[PDB]
């Protein structure tokens, strides 16, 4: 258990790795994250939590950003909608075991220098650049608006204007963190977590289109969504359900199954549980219900605190 | 004599007429104009305020825009170099005879307010569109900046913030003043001056940084300007001496010729300055000094209140 490795682990990239090293030295040392307000908070707003609990217990002081303005230039609606989402999303990640500091990005306006500093580096920033920093971020709209080359340079001034030593989001972040490297003064060690697919197994695990796990999902809702999840036989790459059991089941693990399809089998850990799925062993009904039910245990403690306070 | 007449006097359009003589049965009327601050005013610059002391005397509050911030976004250097520059702009359109509200793009500006409708205009405003506004304004850069695209929403909100009712500007704003026809719920009055052609014919004043007459230039160099300046003999679109001799002069003049030329001739306006220009009744050197010696007259009071 070393605090690199506890950080490292579970995520696509971090750069850079001697950087975090660094970091790591220094007795006084934070972190941020920025979330779009989101009107269903599912596993993968759930992925990050965890990973910034992890950075926490490492010893950082944890910035959570909840990006109203951001999701306002991201075209999610009018932006005191947004922030009541946002308020929403607050308590839910204030129910997930981490003790962090929130920030609204409506709240940094105004400090004058501050909205100068977005003319500043709108002066540093191209247009090909921020719109290239886009394309992972923003479902696209026929002809473009300015808001979205405006967005990513809100994001690093926001990195810059929180004053941490680590900038964390997903693998879809990191053209915008990139140019956050590229445009502050100090560089920021950048930790990417993997993105998790959504379970009709296509796109990501998105807006609430019923291609998501929310942390406050009833029993009936998990186990309904989980059956009928995209979980092709002997297929780990893409498949929704072997992520999940591998970004959030804890191991060993006991998979129940009727004697008849063989006793009940227990993995100890998730690359066993890969080697069995992969070799038909294990099939996916049977691994759809170890999911959900577990799920339930994993995220009870989330969902009775919001329900209610 | 009028005014309406007397405001449409030496403009190229506007936008609309109809709602300017709506505008001009208000009680109150306000009139905006933004510049970018620069070492030299000249008048290109005088030919814009002449326009909007039209305006003052109309009824119209006048509203100076500093914009420092503009120009930040523009790549002229720093805003503390840019604010001071603002400093002797403000000094040299007061000094043109025009008093009113001298405002900066940053003061209004870095405010949450602001800000945020910044913003709500960024959302509404096409990349495509904010882009081609910046045609005849934006600095030359191989590698285009945000900064470009900020520029123009940033002008139409400081046109909606000061809640005026006629936004004035050369015909290089014109793509810009459309942008604010459309994204604000106040369409304002869009009122456009011509552009100067530089002294040497080759673009416009601005600034060029040569080209140019200051309004605060020793006659040494008007005289010395206006003499090596383009003017070809009989044509007059193109031709600065003769937009210098429409915009600034005071008519009837007189024109002082030794005899071996035509003597000295009287001039009822400038259309018939033109009419002698173009038969080459008049040539290009005695058309420039009486040009200079007229500019030296005029900008005089100026020159002399800085």
Do not use: W
């Not at 989330?302 to 329900?307: E, G, P, S, Y």
């Amino acid at each position: 258990m070393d605090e690199f490795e506890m950080i490292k682990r579970n995520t696509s990239e971090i750069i850079s790795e001697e950087e975090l090293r660094e970091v790591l030295k220094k007795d006084e040392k934070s972190a941020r994250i920025g979330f779009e307000p989101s009107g269903k908070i599912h596993l993968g707003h759930y992925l990050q939590i965890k990973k910034m609990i992890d950075l926490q217990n490492a010893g950082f002081d944890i910035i959570i950003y909840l990006a109203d303005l951001g999701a306002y230039l991201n075209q999610k609606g009018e932006l005191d909608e947004i922030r009541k989402i946002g308020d929403y999303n607050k308590k839910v990640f204030e129910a997930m075991g981490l003790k962090a500091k929130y920030v609204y990005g409506s709240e940094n306006c105004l400090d004058k220098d501050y909205t100068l500093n977005v003319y500043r580096l709108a002066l540093k920033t191209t247009l090909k650049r921020a719109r290239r920093s886009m394309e992972l971020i923003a479902r696209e709209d026929e002809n473009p608006k300015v808001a979205e080359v405006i967005y990513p340079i809100m994001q690093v001034n926001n990195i810059h204007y929180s004053g941490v030593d680590v900038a964390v989001g997903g693998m879809e972040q990191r053209k915008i963190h990139m140019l956050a490297r590229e445009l502050l003064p100090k560089k920021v060690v950048c930790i990417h977590n993997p993105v998790l697919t959504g379970l009709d197994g296509e796109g990501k695990m998105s807006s609430s289109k019923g291609n998501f796990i929310a942390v406050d999902d009833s029993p009936e809702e998990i186990r309904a969504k989980i059956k009928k999840a995209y979980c092709p036989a002997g297929v780990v790459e893409g498949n929704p359900i072997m992520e999940i059991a591998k970004y959030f089941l804890e191991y060993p693990l006991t998979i129940k199954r009727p004697e008849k399809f063989g006793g009940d089998l227990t993995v100890n850990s998730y690359e066993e549980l890969e080697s069995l799925f992969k070799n038909k062993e294990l099939h996916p009904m049977d691994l759809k219900n170890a999911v959900a039910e577990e799920l339930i245990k994993i995220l009870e403690p989330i969902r009775k605190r919001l329900l209610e306070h």
